[PDB]
Every structure is written in C-alpha cells, then in structure tokens.
Amino acid sequence: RATLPYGSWPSPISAADVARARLRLSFPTVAGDDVWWQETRPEEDGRTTVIHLRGGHRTELLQAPWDARTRVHEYGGRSYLPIRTAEGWSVVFSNYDDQRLHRLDEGDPKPYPLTPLPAVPAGLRYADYVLSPDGTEVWCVCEGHIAAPPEPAVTGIRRAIVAIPLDGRAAEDAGAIRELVAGAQFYASPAPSPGGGHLAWVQWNHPRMPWDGTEVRVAAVEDGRTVAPRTVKGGLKESALAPLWRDEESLYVISDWPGWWNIYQVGLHGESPQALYPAEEEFAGPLWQLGGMPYALLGDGRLAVLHGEGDLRLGVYDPETLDLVDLEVPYEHWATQLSADGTTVVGIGGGPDLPASVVRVDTTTGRVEGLRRELAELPNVAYLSRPRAERLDGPFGRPVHAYVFPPTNPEAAAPEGELPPYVVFVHGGPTGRVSTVLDLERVYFTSRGIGVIDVNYGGSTGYGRAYRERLRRQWGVVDVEDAIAAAQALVDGGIADPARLAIRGGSAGGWTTLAAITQTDVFKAATSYFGISDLQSFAEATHDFESQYLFGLIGPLPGFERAYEERSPLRHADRTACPVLLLQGLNDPVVPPDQSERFALALADKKMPYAYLTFEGESHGFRKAGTVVRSLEAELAFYGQTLGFEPRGVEPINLTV
C-alpha cells in the first residue's frame, strides 16, 4: 500500500463515471418471452426511452426527439404500456414536452397522438395506464391543469380516471375521452376485473397523503358506466393500495390495518377481510410514483411478493398451503415494480455489491438472469465500501436506523493519528428510505478516503407505521435530532474526525441540512441540493401533490403560521454555522428556485461564505450527466476547502461574501 491523509486518496471512480451510471432502470414489463423496461440516457439530455428485449436482442423504441415521461404528480412513473396487436406489439407512452399520450407501432417508426393538445402547455397528463377489458381503450389516471379565463395562468387541478380510445379519435377531440371515475382529488391503480364486470381503484383527498390514508373502491360496470361503488379497504388513518383481482368477485389489497403494510383478501360484499400471512414486515412502499405494483400473480395462482423490515426481498406465497417462501436469490432489495407472466417474474433488483438492474426469475426452476445493469464498468470490488447497519440510540431511547460506509480503498491508508472526515447523508423524500443497493455516489467519496453515513431518520418508511409517524408535526426537529445523533455517535465511537463533518441532502434532505446548520454547530460544511428554506412560500408555490404535506409535517395551515416562520432556516440565516453550497435546477416544479436564491442572498447580507450553482434545463433532481459532473466535482472540492484536505483531481471553488 501507500499512506496518504484521508480525503487525498486517488480513486478510479470519476464524477463522470457516476453521471454515466444514472440510468434509472424502472418499470419492467414481461409478456411471454418479451421484456420491456424504461431507461434514462444521461448523456442525451437525460431523456427517457423504452427498451424491448427478446432473445438477447435489446432494441430502443424511442429515438432522440421523444421522451417517455409523464408528469402526473410531477414525479410520474411508468410512462409506457405495451399493447398486443395482431402480429406485433404496439406501445403507448407519455411524451415529456407536450404530455400528450402517443402511440407507436412496431413496423412504423413515427409515433402519433391519441389525446388533444392541452389548453395550457402540459395541462393534460396521463399515468398508470391499463388496457380496457375489451381492448379499444386505455384506462388511465388523467391530471388536468385548469386555465385562468380570458400564456394561460393555472388556477386549479382536476383529476379523473379516464378512457382513451386507441384509434386517435381524441387526437383532436376531448369529447372522445370519457370520465369513468371522477370526484376525488387523487386517483391511482385502476384495475379492471377478470370478467370486466367490475373496476377497482385507489382514491384519496387532500389533507392526506396516500401513505396516511387511502380508499380502495370497487364498483360494478353496467352499460359502460360505474355503478354501486363501495369501499373494500382503507380509511383516513389507513393506507390501502394496489388492488389485484384474484377472480371475479374477489381481490387482494395491501393495507396497514395492523401497523404494517400486509396482504388482505377481500370480497365485494361481506365485510370480513382475511389477513393472509400477517407479519411485522412492510409488503409495499410509499406511493410517490404511479405505475408500479409490489405483488404479481403467477399463472398458477401463487403470488410473487415483496416483503421485509428494511430492504424488500422477493418471495412467493402459496394460497394452497398458506406458506410464504423466499426465493434463493443474490438480490437483497427490490423496487416495488414487479411484473409477471406464467412462472416468470421480472423486476428491479440490487444489493450491497450489486447495483440496480433488471432481473428475470423463474418460480419453478429458480433460474435468475441479469438483463441490464445501471453500470457496465464493473468497478474493482476493493474500492466498493461495504455498508454496516447500525441502530443509533435516539432521544427518548428511540432507535434510529442508519447505514455506515467506511472509507475503503485497497491502495492507500491514513497516517498514525488521523481520523477520517465523514459526511452524513440525509435521504431526500421525507417519507422514504435509503437501501443497501450499491450507489456509485457514495463510492465516489468512500474510495477517496471520506466516510459516509446514510441515516433512515424518523419518518423514514419501511420500518412500520409508528416509525413513519414519528415525524408528524416534528419536521425540522426529529430529522435534525436523528441526523445530529448519527454524527455524534460516529464521533463518540472514535470513528470520525469531530472537526471535519459535513451534512448533505436532496429535496427534503436540503431542508434537513439547512435546519441542522441553523440549529447546531457539529457540521463544518454543508451541501443542499435544491432544498427548502422558507416553508410558507414553499407551501404556496409548490406543486399540487405536495401542497398540504406540511400540514402533517409541521401542522395545519390556518393556524401554524408562527411555526412555519420559526422553523424556516431563511429567517435565521445568521445562525448558519458553516459554509454552504447550494445547488439548484432552474426548471424545478417542486422546490421553486426562489428558496435557494433567497437563502443565498440572506447568507450575503450576513457576510456568510456560500456558493450557489444553477443549472439550466434541469428539473427537480439532476438527470443530465454534465450537471452531475459539475456539481459532484464541486461538492468534493468544497469539502476539501471547508473541512481540511486536498482532494485529487478537482480545484476549489469561490466562496462569496
């Protein structure tokens, strides 16, 4: 080996390597020997395309002009639906730029519209597509942006479950689109039943989020309309989602009635749900993106299921024997995006030393196949840091789960009496979690001598409903405390350099870093990727799906103004403890760039050292390889100058006053 001071290590993982590996493999589909999935191309302006795989030949359906990406809830999800047509496969998708739903026929390279042009630019949006029981229509969730009356301003949102005819009669007639279900503010997971005599969906309304409480409604279909609707499962304090028919007259749902997402079988009249296999393990996730299922039906009636406290692992339930048997597989964490036909299941799998990749399993033989991975340059296993799981002890004796990635490099070590700098990662979506799945973004630091700790703080999902509710009305308190607890535990344990600690985070993670900076002094450097700094202006400016989220994170708005004011870092810029690095996409519909720029102006006016980088043509979350390169090299160099080292291969940036 050699011996260099921590942080100065030389590493083969380059910022560009991390950028090129941000493929975003998502939403596989499987029909017979045909597989489909969704890939984002980071070196083509982050556009998303659909890929078809048969017999090892994998072909790209959407050439450069197109971009399969819906904007329902601004986060979208599955943007394509493969339709089986006489001698071939047609495919419908959502085109980013105009949000219209377009159709594409194998045998024709030019896709064509099926929905009208919106009144305002992307004011009609489609998602969670399903093929109607007789073909000849796509049933899907529709999101409508209402134009102010006579550059049309937008004054409201109208959502519905809607029927689009597959023959382009609606390309120039909105009167061809039919409202099947309407009346609630949020819809998801529309599910025609086997005979076609019923229709099921998930709906919820505004003060709530889909993980707070939902309703799975099923109604009969008569003369082509809905009749006799009914709730089969869920409520205000109960999140029930993913309707999956088992036969005519009976279906599967996932509900957290017992405090964990479990599987229930419910009928259409008798109010007596049967709990299949009740466990203290989550069987689903938070519904941030539409178009994904956590369970699938096999040709024989068994269920392919995802389950676990923490990482989701893949098993099979046998309703004939009531057993749940895990499939012997090298993948430790799966996304809630399964597809299945016959004995073949398909999904997105990964684990500690496996990056996310499209996987194909076979439930009779057990054969597992790896179809596509997020990165081909398979890095040397020596440079990959192995995640160590720890239960930090929180304030009232409450456990706080974390993952520790030590600085790992096989050709360097630190001098006699040095401790490594560490960065606390705050995972972004308040109601989400980080998994063990290999993330080159962490390796980029660990390989260079910088340790990482990724904290699934209170409010994180995946560890029970209670754990998730620990964050209610405590935002800017429970997350800050749990992050600080992680850093202080690493210091108390002789692991971390207490004078070189940083915090960084994404959307809510930027909120958490700014809250921590302005409430404590443990961290000596901070990076906020498009975080929130003032809560009221955020609630008033943000997009609809998250426009009353703060009512649960901080509190109901006609009433908690003083809390929105007191907790906002923007109001306390002078309490900022360390230099700050702000990163912002200029076309962000979730966190308007006002938050970052106003905070930056406040750190001036207080002669506090900051640096604020803006990127054009980038939305909420960085998609373009060049953007990731610029910001990641900036962040490494920034930690170098603020905390104390000279990182190979990047020169430091200007801090302002």
Identity of the residue numbered 588: D
Are the CB atoms for 421 and 501 separated by under 8 Å?
yes
* Boundary residue ending a domain (375, 409, 424): 375
Q: How many CB atoms are located within 10 Å of the residue 477 CB?
A: 16
* Cα three-residue angle 131-132-136, rounded to 5 degrees: 90
What 3-state DSSP class applies to 365? coil
Are the CB atoms for 194 and 247 separated by under 8 Å?
yes
Identity of the residue numbered 633: E
Same-domain check for residues 558 and 621: yes
Maximum C-alpha span of the chain: 80
What 3-state DSSP class applies to 587? coil
Which residues does 533 contact at the CB level (< 8 Å), separation at least 6? Answer: 511, 514, 568, 569, 570, 595, 596, 598, 599
* Boundary residue ending a domain (375, 391, 411): 375
Which residues does 208 contact at the CB level (< 8 Å), separation at least 6? Answer: 214, 236, 552
| 247, two tokens | 């036969």
Identity of the residue numbered 110: K
Are the CB atoms for 432 and 288 separated by under 8 Å?
yes
Calpha distance 81→532 (Å, rounded):
35
| 4, two tokens | 């260099």
Identity of the residue numbered 544: D
Cα dihedral 429/434/438/439 (nearest 10): 30
Same-domain check for residues 357 and 400: no
State the angle between helix axes of 478-492 and 507-519 in degrees (0 to 180), rounded to the nearest 10.
70
Same-domain check for residues 398 and 364: no
Same-domain check for residues 471 and 343: no
Calpha distance 423→412 (Å, rounded):
20
- What is the Cα 624 distance to its own chain's centre? 17
Calpha distance 203→141 (Å, rounded):
11
The beta strands (E) that lie in 488-646 are given as 501-505, 525-529, 580-585, 610-615
Same-domain check for residues 606 and 489: yes
Same-domain check for residues 115 and 234: yes
What 3-state DSSP class applies to 436? coil
Distances, alpha carbon 327 to alpha carbons 262, 305, 588, in Å: 19, 10, 41
Helices marked H in 568-655 — which ranges?
A: 594-603, 625-639
Same-domain check for residues 360 and 384: no
* Boundary residue ending a domain (375, 394, 409): 375
Cα dihedral 12/451/4/642 (nearest 10): 100
Q: Which among 5, 7, 38 has a CA at the least distance from the CA of 23? A: 38
Are the CB atoms for 576 and 607 separated by under 8 Å?
no
Identity of the residue numbered 493: G
Same-domain check for residues 370 and 482: no
Question: What end-to-end distance do the CA atoms of the chain give, in Å?
Answer: 42
Are the CB atoms for 358 and 338 separated by under 8 Å?
no
Same-domain check for residues 370 and 389: no
| 526, two tokens | 């901070």
For the chain, the helix, strand and coil percentages under 3-state DSSP, each to the nearest 5: 20, 35, 45
Which residues does 547 contact at the CB level (< 8 Å), separation at least 6? Answer: 206, 539
Specify the resolution in Å: 3.0
Domain count, the chain: 2
Calpha distance 273→293 (Å, rounded):
21
* Region for 332 from its dihedrals, namely left if φ exceeds 0, alpha if ψ lies in -120 to 50, beta otherwise: alpha
Same-domain check for residues 415 and 363: no
| 97, two tokens | 């730029």
β pairing state of 323-326 and 333-334? unpaired
Same-domain check for residues 363 and 386: no
Give the domain extent around 144. 1-375
Distances, alpha carbon 524 to alpha carbons 18, 45, 406, 577, 598, in Å: 25, 34, 19, 7, 22
* Cα three-residue angle 86-89-91, rounded to 5 degrees: 125
Same-domain check for residues 513 and 523: yes
- Which run of H or of E encompasses 559? helix 557-567
Calpha distance 588→595 (Å, rounded):
11
585-613 burial, b if ≥16 CB within 10 A, otherwise e? beebebbbbebbebbbebbeeeebbbbbe
For 296, which DSSP code? Answer: E
For 572, which DSSP code? Answer: G
Calpha distance 325→305 (Å, rounded):
10
